[PDB]
């Protein structure tokens, strides 16, 4: 499963169901951000 | 040479917010006039970054900058998108080793805080 193919998939058809399928298939890995900056 | 990002939307906001509250804190409360910046570093194995975000009652400023490894390239220019109506999503290929800057800009908002539901993925 090439990355650009995963992108075209999520772009063309997108739902929580597809997001979870890609996740379960390891096609996409969830990521927690390292830092969150704030400012005014 | 930097590749243009992909950007789209999907109609289900409710299913999104429901699952985001499920997973983690993962909700940024943006104060009046405040600008939050989420730093997402690039992964060596990873080719691609995927972002999703939505808001409760109002729009918010959103854009994406790429910081190298301090030069800054503009991936997604910061504009006001309506995420309260629907979920905004997008993706971008890695220009190289660096860090992605996800901008949530409430600056224009005098009286209103913004609750931002967001999620991030990467391939490979």
Numbering used by the authors:
A (entry chain B): 16 to 55
B (entry chain A): 368 to 436, 474 to 528
Could you share sentences copied from the article?
ACBD3 is a Golgi resident protein involved in the maintenance of the Golgi structure and regulation of intracellular trafficking between the endoplasmic reticulum and the Golgi. However, in enterovirus-infected cells, the ACBD3 GOLD domain interacts preferentially with viral non-structural 3A proteins, which causes re-localization of ACBD3 to the sites of virus replication. In this study, we present a structural, biochemical, and biological characterization of the complexes composed of human ACBD3 and the 3A proteins of four representative enteroviruses. The crystal structures revealed the details of the ACBD3-3A interaction, the 3A-3A interaction causing the assembly of the ACBD3-3A heterotetramers, the interaction between the ACBD3-3A complex and the lipid bilayer, and the roles of these interactions in facilitation of enterovirus replication.
The second strategy took advantage of the fact that in all three solved GOLD: 3A structures the C terminus of the ACBD3 GOLD domain was located in the vicinity of the N terminus of the ordered part of the 3A protein. This allowed us to design GOLD-3A fusion proteins with the last residue of ACBD3 (R528ACBD3) fused through a short peptide linker (GSGSG) to the first predicted ordered residues of the respective 3A proteins (e.g. K153A/EVA71). The overall structures of all solved GOLD: 3A complexes are highly similar to each other. This suggests that neither the L24A mutation in the GOLD: 3A/PV1 complex nor the fusion-protein strategy used for the GOLD: 3A/EVA71 complex affected the overall fold of the complexes. Analysis of the crystal structures of the GOLD: 3A complexes revealed that the 3A proteins formed either one of the crystal-packing contacts (as in the case of EVD68 and PV1) or contacts with the second 3A molecule when two GOLD: 3A complexes per asymmetric unit were present (as in the case of EVA71 and RVB14). This putative dimerization interface is formed by the two central alpha helices of the 3A proteins, which are bent 180° to form a helical hairpin. The dissociation constants of the GOLD: enterovirus 3A complexes ranged approximately from 1 μM (EVD68 and RVB14) to 15 μM (EVA71).
